[PDB]
């Protein structure tokens, strides 16, 4: 198979509205934020404006093809794929996607989608000008899929990606799995809590 | 039935432009705002900038399927469903939807749509710096469907969802049914009046 | 007929690009602005930022159905209808539509479209802080249809709709028919001239 | 023929990607800016924010119909027509189109497209507060079509269109044909140079 | 062939989602930024707001036609072509395209796409008020195609720059580089554009 045939097959059979659950087991979505920049911080309003790469991976076996004498990977517009309905629960702006809306699909049906996103959050900015710094917690999970349909799995150098020219510096980035239950709904929603420990230079 | 079949059936037959009225009775829409944040307040201009979850529920029987050996619920893009044409009558900005535009559809045809919205309103900001606080009234109803086609009923801890990091705190949220009539339009439009009693901290 | 059938018929035979002129009629468009709020005013730049409901009515007989044992009215997305190409001749921003883009269609083919619009205008802001107040004139007409294809007529109670919480108050709103001809364009374009007489409140 | 038939024919057979060159001669595009407002001026940064009507005319014979017992003109969405790929070479913002995206097509295939555009430019703002005023030059031509495919031809005092309520006033507008050539690329690109001589009011 | 036939053929057989690799060799994309304006500079935040023409060329043989008794070139909307998924790695705003989204296609299948882009970057603004000036580095490469699928090669400076800018350009150097991250085992080719400029 060549790229043209694989991309034709994916475009024609996609089902972007269909979560690719296998035998009633959840789709395992891995999420990791790579912080690139901290653009604006307000200790009064407890608001941060940040740029991060939202590394997102999951498996969709309906995309898979025989890799023998074929590419191992193709670039696919996300309009042709099911994508996790991830939201930042404490976002106060729409995610502004800075990059081409393409994901990498591996021949086994693994999808790697890593948009660069600029977004504003409501989080703890207190202590940003101290040596301990602020710890801003960003919570990311499925908006409509509970633990039986989507699970969020949090799994090196925090400053490998971070701009040397930022007014701020990153002390630590921790990612923990959590679960939130709401009075509307008997179901638990999995999220990743991203703790951004940072300070002014 | 599996998810793929249910979502295929809904996409093919949903009729998103068709209000799902049963036997000439109005579609009962439940609306409840869960306030998440108050970002900006201006006592001079009487303007607030707020983030809320607009919990919206109604029944569309044309979406229903046999739940035996099937999912009880699916996630559906709102472009594939009829959705109430709700508007805030005192909004001064477009609703900025912060979340994926998906609704939950139950096998009985109940729809749950809860977007996170950031929006600016013209309302009473007077007394925001006092202990009694300001009471900002937000009116939400159908833009084009009158009382015979859509009824809007409020569903109802106010601060269960509210950000601990806001400069403001919520004293009380009351959500009451009302109606608006204008000279333009001979019909009554049902709304939910949401009274946000809040104040600056410290 | 039920709602589903009427909306199917409109969606399937909807020619949204086709002005519904009849034999020896222009399409008669009624326009009336209901001011809801005045958000920002600049006496230096002569700019206002306003929210208004643009009450718009006209007839499209191709939408009509037999009302016997049928709804009298349906809600239709404007993407499925011809809509007048109205523009504010002195607008300095794109109209920001704040409301769902649905119109009401009556069984006789009358269309009622009333978007809530936020828009900025270049107009006379001088005297906004006085008792007489400023008079800001907004001109709205068809961008491309002249008097033989579209006529614009004003449809009236000014302050029924206006926010009590505005920094400003409305003294008077007058809406009068006018016509503009420019040297560019040999035809006359009908407009509604909306005179917004308003002032700042005391603090 | 009625309007519905003409607009059907144009929608079905309009090749919007195909420049309507006749017998290997360039498409003659007429361009004239009618200034409506000057909203913001910065003498430090040499930037202006302006509103103008971009009067644009050209012929596309593939649109033509027999005018006998038919309309002489129809309104056509520009998505259904070939339109010149005009750009302002010294623009520092995207053209913000304030008007419905419709052109007028005459039965002989003449197209009149006149959008109202708000756009920011890098140009000479020096002397804006003097009696002689600033002269801001705006250059408009085809982005991708050279002189053999598109020619750009200008069609006084802009007092007829200019807002009496502007902080600024127009002293003179001159619109002259020019060409830009780069050393990289052997073809000339025709432009209209629009000299906006304006000043702040006393 | 006339323009109508060429544009019909391109529109119909346009696979815009398909990188036009020939025998598993990378598509060679040439990139050169022509700076037109520097609008805003902040030495505190290390942010610049710039306007540039992103001269982009590559070959797509599926677009090619016999030039005998035909046009040598046509203008094609980029929605009808494969276009490189180029991104500025240090951009802090979406590229704002100021120009009509058309490319030039030559009869041999060479594509010339040169949008005017306004974009904000995080880069070294230190020394902007000195005689040596600031050196702001902008890195542009494929977002999803590694070195085996796309190569980026750089191609007179200040022929294009606005005389009315508060800033002036001392030098522009454009050099090939490669970036590898711990996340991702593949190397991504970029062009590093060093904009040496200062306040007047
Ligand atoms: N497609 C163009 C290229 O060759 O790269 C055609 C020439 N061009 C241009 C830009 C502004 C003014 C005149 C020509 C760049 C795009
Ligand atoms: C749904 O299907 C099941 C299994 O075929 C059947 O037993 C059940 O009665 C059906 N429910 C209804 C409401 O018809
Ligand atoms: C236009 O009208 C003339 C006069 O009758 C006629 O001869 C000609 O064939 C007509 N054109 C078309 C396209 O029918």
Residue numbers in the entry:
A (entry chain B): 20 to 174, 178 to 223
B (entry chain C): 20 to 175, 179 to 224
C (entry chain D): 20 to 174, 178 to 225
D (entry chain E): 20 to 174, 178 to 224
E (entry chain A): 20 to 174, 179 to 223
Mind quoting what the paper says about this structure?
AChBPs are homopentameric, water-soluble homologs of the ligand-binding domain of LGICs and well-established structural surrogates for nicotinic acetylcholine receptors (nAChR). Importantly, AChBPs can bind nAChR-specific ligands and induce similar conformational changes as in the membrane bound receptors. LGICs are activated by ligands binding at subunit interfaces of their extracellular domains, thereby inducing conformational changes that affect the structure of a central pore and its ability to transport ions through the membrane.
In total, five structures of Ls-AChBP in complex with a ligand were successfully solved. The electron density in the binding site region was generally poor, indicating that compounds may have had several binding modes in the site. A computational alignment and superimposition of AChBP taken from the protein–ligand complexes and the apo structure showed that there were no large global conformational changes in any of the structures upon ligand binding. When comparing the protomers in complex with a ligand we observed that loop C moves differently upon binding of different compounds. Notably, binding of FL1888, VUF24234 and VUF6105 results in a movement of the loop closer to the compound, while binding of FL1856, FL3044, FL1613 and FL1909 does not have the same effect. The plot indicates that binding of nicotine, FL1613, FL1909, FL1856 and FL3044 do not result in any significant conformational changes in this region, while binding of FL1888, VUF24234 and VUF6105 do.
